[PDB]
Amino acid sequence: MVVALGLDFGTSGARAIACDFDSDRSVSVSVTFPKTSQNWPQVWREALWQLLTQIPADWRSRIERIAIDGTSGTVLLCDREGQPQTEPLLYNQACPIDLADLADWVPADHAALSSTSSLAKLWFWQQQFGALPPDWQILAQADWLSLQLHGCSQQSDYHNALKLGYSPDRERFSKNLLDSELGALLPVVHEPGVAIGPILPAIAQEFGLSPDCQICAGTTDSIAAFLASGAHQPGEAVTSLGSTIVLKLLSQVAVSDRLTGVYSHKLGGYWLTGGASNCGGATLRQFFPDTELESLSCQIDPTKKSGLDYYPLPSRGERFPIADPDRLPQLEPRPENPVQFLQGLLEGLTQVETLGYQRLQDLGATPLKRIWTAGGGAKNAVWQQLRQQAIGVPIAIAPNTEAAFGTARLAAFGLAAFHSA
């Protein structure tokens, strides 16, 4: 019944989606980020006000809850007032630090043990600033942007906080990390979806929002994209068939594998696990454009195996399901008819998804029940036939894939659906 606002801040831009879930009606507005900037916080915040502005007044007067998802790993170093004291470290930027320095702050093989993690970037900043002031704070993109709305400093969610060192399984930072030099900069971690506080009165009156509107705890954009699908039962999974095949499986058990980068986000009483293969649509685009890809797909009969057996790597190295930094793209033997060649490629990608989900299950995750598909290859029915014959479960196109929609659902209902009974 709630009318909720989902704010999505991703890699290339930002999208706002407001939904009346009672009548199931929505409105969506967009803003495109520059290719690069000199003041990214300014870009993000201006994008925030711009998004709020593009939303109709009749909608804004009825928004009761707001949630924000941001890119994972994009952090900001700020004072007490939330003002950036240096350039933000982006999601894709790595830091040349020694992970052994973070050994006594998180358990072994923790997800925060990565050169691109928020914790590694915090330690990074600590190195060049020498001594970070105790009254300062580190804030993920979503954290900072929501801070622009509710004004409560040092507030984050246990999705963004995971790679900062948070342990969602025991729902805490280690006492070693809390009593460390970085502990004073750490945020208070809440569950994604819960109310942090009311919206700032000035902001509410300025943008014609209700002064009783609640600003909720945020999440990451990939998780929000998963939330867009609506899947909330263990064994349900979302497959993203984009440039790279990305699997996300909902399970009752947290599974992990550091060699393949597999970890688990907490999701209510459940866990969202998954992985990412280097194979994907990019390998297909190496041979055919999209139009030719379709033109050939319409001639493929998935019932009869091509006989070919490819591993559709586009380049050097494979992460998931099996880790091999020196594995070759096996796109041989390439045959006569490009139709059966494309069929072979599709069979390869199919095997990638299959081995992926089966491997996820083998690590202890809840057995697969069904697949919701997103990305460019989602509409490919032949590919879907190969997949749904190889996996063993029903496969359908995800009703919604927009991160902003999943974030709007996060604002409206939180993670309440992700519990036993």
Ligand X SMILES: O=C(CO)[C@H](O)[C@H](O)CO
Note whether 249 binds ligand X by CB under 6 A: no
Residue 317 labelled as part of a binding site? no
Q: Which is nearer to ligand X, 11 or 389 (CB)?
A: 11
Helix ranges (DSSP H) in 112-174: 118-129, 141-150
Note whether 191 binds ligand X by CB under 6 A: no
User: Smallest distance, Å, CB 10 to ligand X?
Assistant: 3
Of 354, 359, 355, 351, which Cα lies nearest the Cα of 308? 351
Note whether 11 binds ligand X by CB under 6 A: yes
Dist CA 386 CA 350 (whole Å): 6
DSSP H or E run through 343: helix 338-362
Q: Which of 3, 5, 6, 15 binds ligand X (CB under 6 A)?
A: 15
Residue 323 labelled as part of a binding site? no
Q: Among the candidate windows 70-78, 158-166, 267-275, 371-379, which touches ligand X by CB under 6 A?
A: 70-78
Q: Where are the beta strands (DSSP E) in 243-289?
A: 245-251, 263-267, 270-276
Dist CA 65 CA 123 (whole Å): 34
User: Smallest distance, Å, CB 342 to ligand X?
Assistant: 27
The neighbour count for residue 207, using CB atoms within 10 Å, is 17
Q: Which is nearer to ligand X, 243 or 358 (CB)?
A: 243
Note whether 47 binds ligand X by CB under 6 A: no
User: How many of the chain's residues bind ligand X (CB under 6 A)?
Assistant: 16
User: Smallest distance, Å, CB 297 to ligand X?
Assistant: 25
Q: Among the candidate windows 3-11, 94-102, 144-152, 153-161, which touches ligand X by CB under 6 A?
A: 3-11
Collapsing DSSP states into helix, strand and coil, what is residue 294? helix
Q: Which of 403, 408, 410, 415 binds ligand X (CB under 6 A)?
A: 403
DSSP H or E run through 372: strand 370-374
Of 318, 327, 329, which Cα lies nearest the Cα of 260? 318
Dist CA 89 CA 67 (whole Å): 23
Q: Which is nearer to ligand X, 72 or 167 (CB)?
A: 72
Dist CA 22 CA 37 (whole Å): 40
Q: Among the candidate windows 4-12, 164-172, 344-352, 406-414, which touches ligand X by CB under 6 A?
A: 4-12
Q: Among the candidate windows 45-53, 71-79, 373-381, 390-398, which touches ligand X by CB under 6 A?
A: 71-79
User: Smallest distance, Å, CB 79 to ligand X?
Assistant: 25
Q: One symbol per residue from 74 to 113: x for binding ligand X (CB under 6 A), - otherwise; what is it? A: -----------------x----------------------
Q: Which of 220, 297, 388, 401 binds ligand X (CB under 6 A)?
A: 220
Q: Distance between alpha carbon 78 and the CA centroid of its chain, in Å?
A: 24
Q: Which of 14, 68, 189, 231 binds ligand X (CB under 6 A)?
A: 14
In degrees and rounded to multiples of 5, residue 375 shows phi and psi of: 95, -175
Whether 311 contacts 330, CB under 8 Å: yes
Q: Which is nearer to ligand X, 9 or 125 (CB)?
A: 9
Dist CA 421 CA 418 (whole Å): 9
Q: Among the candidate windows 10-18, 166-174, 300-308, 381-389, which touches ligand X by CB under 6 A?
A: 10-18
Q: Which of 143, 157, 191, 221 binds ligand X (CB under 6 A)?
A: 221
Q: Which is nearer to ligand X, 91 or 341 (CB)?
A: 91
Whether 144 contacts 241, CB under 8 Å: no
Note whether 12 binds ligand X by CB under 6 A: yes
Q: Residue 48 contacts by C-beta under 8 Å, 6 or more apart in sequence?
A: 7, 14, 145, 148
Of 33, 39, 31, 26, which Cα lies nearest the Cα of 11? 33
Helix ranges (DSSP H) in 130-199: 141-150, 175-178
Residue nearest to ligand X (CB): 10
Note whether 72 binds ligand X by CB under 6 A: yes
What is the identity of the amino acid at 209?
L
Instruction: Show binding-site residues for substrate.
Output: 8, 12-15, 72, 221
Instruction: Show binding-site residues for ATP.
Output: 243, 281, 376-380
| Site of interaction with ligand X (CB under 6 A) | 8, 10-15, 30, 71-73, 91, 220-222, 403
